[PDB]
Amino acid sequence: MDITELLAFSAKQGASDLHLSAGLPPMIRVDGDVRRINLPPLEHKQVHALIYDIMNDKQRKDFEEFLETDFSFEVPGVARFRVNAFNQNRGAGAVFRTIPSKVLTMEELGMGEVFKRVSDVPRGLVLVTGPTGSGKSTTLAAMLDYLNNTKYHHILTIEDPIEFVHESKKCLVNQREVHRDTLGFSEALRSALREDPDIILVGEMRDLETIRLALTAAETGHLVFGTLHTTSAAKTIDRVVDVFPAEEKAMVRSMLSESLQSVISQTLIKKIRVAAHEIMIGTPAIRNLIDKVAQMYSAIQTGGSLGMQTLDMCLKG
């Protein structure tokens, strides 16, 4: 009995995660809960076996050198998994996070015109944020899909790794997977500025160079999508400007305030699982606001007739 059977089983169960922990049977997180599969506990040896069985030298070298490591792993028919191996008090430990295979519709998600409208801006920056778990990628996928269905454009994405896979419809879609198709977000980004892209998607925004660059893309005339694990328009902004050395905030705050087209912060809630969105749209007033970002909320609250909304506001809905 090997890790594929297990992984396969996770998927068939709708599991978002598979957890291996020396000393316990495999468990899966489903609808947020983490629960044992009806199988015998896995002793250290076993889990460690299971793990090594799907790593290569490098990975095996790290894991042993640094006691923990990350890599992705694919189950051909089933799905791809993000995989983190680590050691704990009882022995080996690995968690598998299943990656959304299918890129779902906008209607399928019940998203409205507001989204299209945002997706339609000719250029500038759009940030779709949300606590790691709120399915950012999907909203994104859907918005991307929407353009791929309506514009004869060139969507260039940079993912670490690639999440959904899109089919080139009206758009040339080129997805580059960090570490396989490209050396990193910054390298890839630079190239992008000369790959004739219309729309650029940047998965993770780990280092400043990625931000820095991403901004120049928005500034030089493209439409760019990136994501932060901020949970609020206001926080999102702060987050972006605040990670820069004092001596450089101005230039960033300035840039952003000019290219920021909209910010969407998302989050999942248990359905009588449905997504709540805070929506903030670019607006001459808000532009300015971008050091008085404090007075952003009430701005969004009165932004209704453009389609904006407080998260709480959305909630009550």
Which one of 20-28, 32-40, 136-144, 231-239 is the stretch in contact with Cl ion (CB under 5 A)? 136-144
Give least dist CB 60 to Cl ion, A. Answer: 28
Confirm or reject binding of residue 203 to Cl ion (CB under 5 A).
Answer: no
Confirm or reject binding of residue 135 to Cl ion (CB under 5 A).
Answer: yes
- Taking alpha carbons only, the member of 288, 286, 282, 283 closest to residue 296 is 286
- Reduce the DSSP state of residue 91 to 3 states and report it: strand
The whole-angstrom separation of Cα 220 and Cα 198 is 11
Query: Closer CB to Cl ion, residue 135 or residue 203?
Result: 135
Answer yes or no: is 134 a known binding residue: yes
Residue 135, contacted partner among Cl ion, a second copy, none, CB below 5-8 A by kind: Cl ion
Query: Closer CB to a second copy, residue 87 or residue 105?
Result: 87
Which one of 25-33, 129-137, 223-231, 286-294 is the stretch in contact with Cl ion (CB under 5 A)? 129-137
Beta-bridged to residue 34, according to DSSP, are 29
Give least dist CB 23 to Cl ion, A. Answer: 27
DSSP type of residue 296: G
The whole-angstrom separation of Cα 255 and Cα 249 is 10
Which one of 109-117, 139-147, 250-258, 305-313 is the stretch in contact with a second copy (CB under 8 A)? 250-258
Give least dist CB 2 to Cl ion, A. Answer: 29
Residue 35, contacted partner among a second copy, Cl ion, none, CB below 5-8 A by kind: a second copy
The whole-angstrom separation of Cα 252 and Cα 312 is 29
The whole-angstrom separation of Cα 258 and Cα 269 is 33
CA 213, distance to chain mean position in Å, is: 18
Confirm or reject binding of residue 174 to a second copy (CB under 8 A).
Answer: yes
Give least dist CB 293 to a second copy, A. Answer: 11
Which one of 21-29, 108-116, 135-143, 177-185 is the stretch in contact with Cl ion (CB under 5 A)? 135-143
CA-based max dimension of the chain: 61
Which H/E stretch holds residue 260?
Answer: strand 260-269
Q: Which residue is nearest to Cl ion (CB)?
A: 135
- Entry field: residues in the chain: 317
- CB proximity list for 238: less than 8 A, separation 6 or greater: 230, 293
Confirm or reject binding of residue 44 to a second copy (CB under 8 A).
Answer: no
Of 263-302, binders to Cl ion (CB under 5 A) are none
Other beta carbons within 10 Å of 265: 27
**Binding a second copy by CB under 8 A: which of 6, 7, 54, 95?**
95
Sign of the C-alpha dihedral computed for residues 172, 178, 183 and 186 taken in this order: positive
Answer yes or no: is 133 a known binding residue: yes
Binding site for Cl ion (CB under 5 A): 135, 137
- Which residues are annotated binding-site positions for ATP? 82, 133-138
